[PDB]
């Protein structure tokens, strides 16, 4: 079981999101901080989701860089099945 062996190595390894901020949005939904390593996996699973979108929007920016636009997020989230919306009203 790799994922049990992974979570037992998270007493160290402060992640990119703090546990005072990941734990705040977990307490907002009823998830209470019993184990602080449990928070760090949820903070890691939410990093990997945002990182996978920013890594795939970079491929849609190299073809057309070093700049993240809404026309790069639009085809990047379209394979995810997420239709992002332009503001268009400001």
Partner 1 sequence: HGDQECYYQDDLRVLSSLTKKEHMKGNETMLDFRTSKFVLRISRDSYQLLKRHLQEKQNNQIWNIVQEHLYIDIFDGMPRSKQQIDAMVGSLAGEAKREANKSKVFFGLLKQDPNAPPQNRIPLPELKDSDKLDKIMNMKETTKRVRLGPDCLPSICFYTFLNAYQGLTAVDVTDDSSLIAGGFADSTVRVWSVTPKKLRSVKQASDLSLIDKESDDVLERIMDEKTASELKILYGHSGPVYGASFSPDRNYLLSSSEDGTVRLWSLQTFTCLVGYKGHNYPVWDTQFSPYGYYFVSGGHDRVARLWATDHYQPLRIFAGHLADVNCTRFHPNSNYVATGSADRTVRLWDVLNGNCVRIFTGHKGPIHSLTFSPNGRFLATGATDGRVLLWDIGHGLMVGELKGHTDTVCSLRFSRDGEILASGSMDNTVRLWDAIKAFEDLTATGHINLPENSQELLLGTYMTKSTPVVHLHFTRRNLVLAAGAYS
Partner 2 sequence: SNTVLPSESMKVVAESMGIAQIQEETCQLLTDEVSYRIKEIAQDALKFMHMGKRQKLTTSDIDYALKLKNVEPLYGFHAQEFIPFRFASGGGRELYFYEEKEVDLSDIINTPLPRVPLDVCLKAHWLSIEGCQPAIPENPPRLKPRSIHELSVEQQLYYKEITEACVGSCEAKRAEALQSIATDPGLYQMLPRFSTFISEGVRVNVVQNNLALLIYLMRMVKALMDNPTLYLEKYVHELIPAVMTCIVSRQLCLRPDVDNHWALRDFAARLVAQICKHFSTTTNNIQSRITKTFTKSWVDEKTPWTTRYGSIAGLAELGHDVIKTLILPRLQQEGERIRSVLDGPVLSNIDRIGADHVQSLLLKHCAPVLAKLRPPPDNQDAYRAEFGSLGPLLCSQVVKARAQAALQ
Partner 3 sequence: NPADNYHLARRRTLQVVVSSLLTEAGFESAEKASVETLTEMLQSYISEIGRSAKSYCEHTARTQPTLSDIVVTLVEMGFNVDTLPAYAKRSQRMVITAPPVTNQPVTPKALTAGQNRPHPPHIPSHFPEFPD
Separation of alpha carbons 65 and 18, rounded Å: 30
- Binding partner 3 (rule: CB under 8 A), the pick from 36, 54, 64, 78 is 54
Q: Does 50 bind partner 2 (CB under 8 A)?
A: no
Applying the rule CB under 8 A, the residues between 7 and 36 that interact with partner 3 are 7, 13-22, 24-26, 28-32, 34
Dihedral sign (CA 43, 45, 49, 54): positive
Using CB under 8 A, which residues numbered 15 to 74 contact partner 1?
27-32
Angstrom distance (rounded) from CA 88 to CA 55: 26
Instruction: Evaluate whether 51 touches 75 at the Cβ level (below 8 Å).
Output: no
Is 89 near partner 2 (CB under 8 A)?
A: yes
Residues forming contacts to partner 2 in the complex (CB under 8 A) are: 68, 77, 81-85, 87, 89-90
């Amino acid at each position: 079981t790799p994922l049990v062996d992974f979570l037992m190595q998270l007493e160290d390894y402060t992640p990119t999101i703090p546990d005072a901020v990941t734990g705040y949005y977990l307490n907002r939904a009823g998830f209470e901080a019993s184990d602080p390593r449990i928070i760090r996996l949820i903070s890691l699973a939410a990093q990997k989701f945002i990182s996978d979108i920013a890594n795939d929007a970079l491929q849609h920016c190299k073809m057309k860089k070093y700049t993240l636009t809404m026309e790069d997020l639009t085809p990047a989230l379209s394979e995810y099945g997420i239709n992002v919306k332009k503001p268009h009203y400001f």
